[PDB]
Homo-oligomer: A and B are copies of this chain.
Amino acid sequence: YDEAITRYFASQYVRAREGFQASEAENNFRLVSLLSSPKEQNRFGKWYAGNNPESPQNIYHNMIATVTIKSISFISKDLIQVRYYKTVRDFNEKENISHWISILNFSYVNAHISTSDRLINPLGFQVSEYRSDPE
């Protein structure tokens, strides 16, 4: 497929995985899950679990964390680098900005997707490996 559409989905994936807002948690969780390989769905879920203090649910509890994409680059046929910053805002007036870099192992799979799951993952974008580190 096009590079623009792959960038489109890599951006989305990183925003949904690394951002957080209570109102959008169920949608973001489901978006990330649908764009993840079964093995990756599982790591993501253990990480997002409410009992993990490093879950976005917890570290951004009562906060809003927005991801701004800086750049997206292909290191390889199936390897994307996404540089971004998180802007985090509390119940008060206080912004902390921090910079991060994510690596996605990805591909597209012709599989079965229900008519409605295709309104989220129309092309079978699948992230098989993922990592986020600060800069």
- Is there a chain B Cβ closer than 8 Å to A61's Cβ? no
Given A21-B23, A23-B21: A119 touches B64 (CB 8 Å cut-off): no
Determine the chain B residues whose CB is within 8 A of the CB of A11 once the complex forms. 119
Main secondary structure of the interface of A (DSSP, over half): helix
Verify A4–B123 contact, CB threshold 8 A: yes
Map CB proximity to B onto A1-27 as digits: 1 under 8 Å, 0 otherwise: 010110110010000000001011000
Q: How far is the CB of A51 from chain B (nearest CB, A)?
A: 26
Spell out A's residues near B (CB within 8 Å). Answer: 2, 4-5, 7-8, 11, 21, 23-24, 64, 69, 116, 118-119, 122-123
Verify A118–B8 contact, CB threshold 8 A: yes
Determine the chain B residues whose CB is within 8 A of the CB of A119 once the complex forms. 7-8, 11, 69
Verify A5–B5 contact, CB threshold 8 A: yes
Q: How far is the CB of A27 from chain B (nearest CB, A)?
A: 9
Given A24-B24, A64-B23: A5 touches B116 (CB 8 Å cut-off): no
Set B5, B24, B122: member contacting A7, Cβ < 8 A? B122
